[PDB]
Amino acid sequence: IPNTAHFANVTQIEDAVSLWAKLKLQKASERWQPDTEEEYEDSSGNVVNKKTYEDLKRQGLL
Amino acid sequence: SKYIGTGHADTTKWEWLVNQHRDSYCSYMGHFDLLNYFAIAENESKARVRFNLMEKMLQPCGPPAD
Amino acid sequence: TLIPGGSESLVYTTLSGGIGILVPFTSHEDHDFFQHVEMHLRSEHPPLCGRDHLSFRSYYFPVKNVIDGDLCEQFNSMEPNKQKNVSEELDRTPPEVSKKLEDIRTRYAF
Amino acid sequence: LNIGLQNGVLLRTVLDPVTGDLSDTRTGSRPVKLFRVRMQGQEAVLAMSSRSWLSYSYQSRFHLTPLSYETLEFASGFASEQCPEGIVAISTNTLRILALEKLGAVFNQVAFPLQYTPRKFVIHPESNNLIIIETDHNAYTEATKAQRKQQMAEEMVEAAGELAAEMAAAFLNENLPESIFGAPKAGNGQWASVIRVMNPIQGNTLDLVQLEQNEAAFSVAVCRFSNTGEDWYVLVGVAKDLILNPRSVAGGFVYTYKLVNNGEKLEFLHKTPVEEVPAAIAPFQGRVLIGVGKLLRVYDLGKKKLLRKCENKHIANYISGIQTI
Amino acid sequence: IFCRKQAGVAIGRLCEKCDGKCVICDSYVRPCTLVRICDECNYGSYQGRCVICGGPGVSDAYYCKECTIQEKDRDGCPKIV
Amino acid sequence: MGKDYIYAVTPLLEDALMDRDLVHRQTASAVVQHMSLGVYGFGCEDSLNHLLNYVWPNVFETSPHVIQAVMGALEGLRVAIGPCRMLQYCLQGLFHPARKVRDVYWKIYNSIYIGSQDALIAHYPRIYNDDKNTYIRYELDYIL
Amino acid sequence: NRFTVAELKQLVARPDVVEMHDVTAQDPKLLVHLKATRNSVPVPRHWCFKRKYLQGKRGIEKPPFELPDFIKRTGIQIDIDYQKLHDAFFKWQTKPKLTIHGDLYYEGKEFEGDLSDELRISLGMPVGPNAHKVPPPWLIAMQRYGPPPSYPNLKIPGLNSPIPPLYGDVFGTNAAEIDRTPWGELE
RNA sequence: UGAAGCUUUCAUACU
Ligand SMILES: CO[C@@]1(C)C[C@@](C)(O)[C@H](O)[C@@H](/C=C\C(C)=C\C[C@H]2O[C@@H](C)[C@H](NC(=O)/C=C\[C@@H](C)OC(C)=O)C[C@@H]2C)O1
């Protein structure tokens, strides 16, 4: 776990690992992840199926 | 201390917040174009908005602790 | 730009049905003259209901780089004695002050 | 005294053995004709150019105001049993008598009635038509009003009493005008919204789309998408089951229309759901930016809905406006 | 040390000793607004007396420009008790 | 007349505000107060905010003359700089765990509140509702 | 019946503003929330210090407060010019390094392709000719080994830039691969 | 590397 201002005045191990899990969840949530967060509509039907992720589109266009 | 709305080292969150809610409602009653904004937003007559604010003046933020 | 062959202004609109503009100054001399007009009219022609003019335009934040031209055009409606007392401090006559007030208005708006 | 040039420009000089005042107004390319008239029962001069102006001070309020008509060539005051105070003005192949009866105003206005409180309108760049959204709280839609009235009728006809005299058929015929008697303000989370296409020269309504009962429009935009051709689209952001105090909303939608027939008709394309009120929509580089509550998103046009492309999640409270240079 | 009861029409006065210096911030530069005092401080034998040292008043008491800017003229009767 | 000379005396006031001597900081605070009330409506907020950044650390001073001069300078900056900045300086200390910080900050806040109570309406920060009480001011969230 | 630091760090949205004494407040949840407002500079940090404020070190010796450049150019140290003093004060006026509203001052805070002409004169490098090749001695290694990967947009005369470029002490230029006029300004 | 606080019989300076 990196040393940051968040982990100050924290002296116990399990408290540190739990607060690290919390901070990880928070930050990972608040970023923009294009791989799972994106709306592609492949040209397979070209007028349907807008639920394609960024990976299924490559599999369909391969 | 004699002025209503002042605080001190023992002031709680509830007293602070009800003080600012109460003078917010009074400021809304005073300024003519804020009441216009609210009456257009919620689609009511201005007399009705004034009466609603006066009725809300009594117990803003709910009843106190314990 | 409101008039053909005029200058660009910032037009705003209000919830009470009012329309107004904010126009930039192009020289330091006009700015200084209008600043002195506002200063002298703040004292010798105070608001009617007991308000301080500088305190009213600083209601939530202090004024910064705006001249109130609605206070300045109240010069044309004062009495001739006070118009002379005001004009003789700007080193000018009342007709010249009136012409200078009309010039900036007709430059931008009607 | 007033000095009229042969151009559309004027001079002025106060009467005295020497000129004391000076004021010139660039207000034409045609010779100025100065004529005598009487406004407010006192003297005034009707200057005339390609446009005809009225010059009048007013208790030290100098006004050079134009009029809402085109060029004339001669005029003077008029008086008759018909109207004892007017003007006799002459035009090309014309003999007119005119009048001016507005006590010192700066704008003249024409009005066109609407249905609900207007929130925002955009201008179509090709046809110069207006796309307006109107929305009201504590309001019924047209269909809800009709069915509520039919409900009240069928319930008052079964009041269990001689079933022999019908006030219900008289209650259903004539609707009292709402511009005079008010709209029925009924409900706390009830909304009513409308999209309107209007010509600004005339006042005629070109198209009208009514939305469902508790949908409230807050944003509108007209744009073109790069992946499509030169087609225009209209995007409308709508809230779903909004409560104001305490604030609560069930969701939101973005409508898409195709704006066909030279900017005169809207045709529904699809309807994309969002998890918060879309309060701002702005065209951006062949795509569109949408503020969905706290979130700022990029959206491209799709065949069945709008496709999310990018997103920022660090704006503080609530997006109320978006502007792009 | 200030009376500070809501005032009225009586005009505060200053003695010859300090004539022209503010009653709030005791300052030697630019006077602005005329001082008003409560009715009790001007009642009876107290009329016209200095608002600082109760002695004979020879001039009108003023708030300085800085005090009126800070609205220190709206705090009540400034007669020192 | 001082509006043209505030930039020239700013480094000297910095040095004096950094000076250990009590008179040096007390007199520098007096200078700040007179300069603030002298220029008002003339657009000198940059240097005055810069100088407030050096005046503010002296609020925890026990000497009566120094704290008197500091209060005077703060009330002059309330006029020249505006109440919004002062509320921004007081917010984090209004509810500090230590009673000394709370006493000092509530004194400063009461001084800011008695003058310009009306402007503060537009400056208060948003405070979220809890389970028992409603704290959001909803009327200001309306959007025409 | 009082939180611990790690327990309160788990409840708040911003744990890095929580401190040692924050769990000892009468309402720590409001305290931490106000400590996270998107403004509101913190407390002067010496409230808990027993050495009061300032003072502390008298070791450092400070020279007399240096006069501003233009004032020191006025030649004050006999004929005196007033117009020079006036024109110089107004026309020669400059703005000193101001600080942001957030920034605060502490006792220890007062201490904590192009080459100059003096360094080129001391290094023994001649001036740039009209149409010739006069590279610096660090340019031969760049011509032999190749361009530096840390700055690929840098241009040097002889390798990427032409010889007629080079002007004065400029021996390099960085070439990175609207309506910017302000709206209302005096003329 | 650092933390110089509290008190008086000191003694010395400034208000
Ligand atoms: C001993 O009596 C006291 C202390 C009390 C009193 C109120 O009873 C008495 O009336 C009062 C009168 C005399 C004195 C000394 C007080 C006020 C005056 O003092 C003077 C010593 C200053 N001198 C200056 O002002 C400096 C400049 C000049 C020319 O002014 C101006 C405006 O540039 C300030 C003030 C003008 O002083």
Ligand SMILES: [Zn+2]
């Ligand atoms: Zn009294």
Ligand SMILES: [Zn+2]
């Ligand atoms: Zn006296």
Ligand SMILES: [Zn+2]
């Ligand atoms: Zn005073």
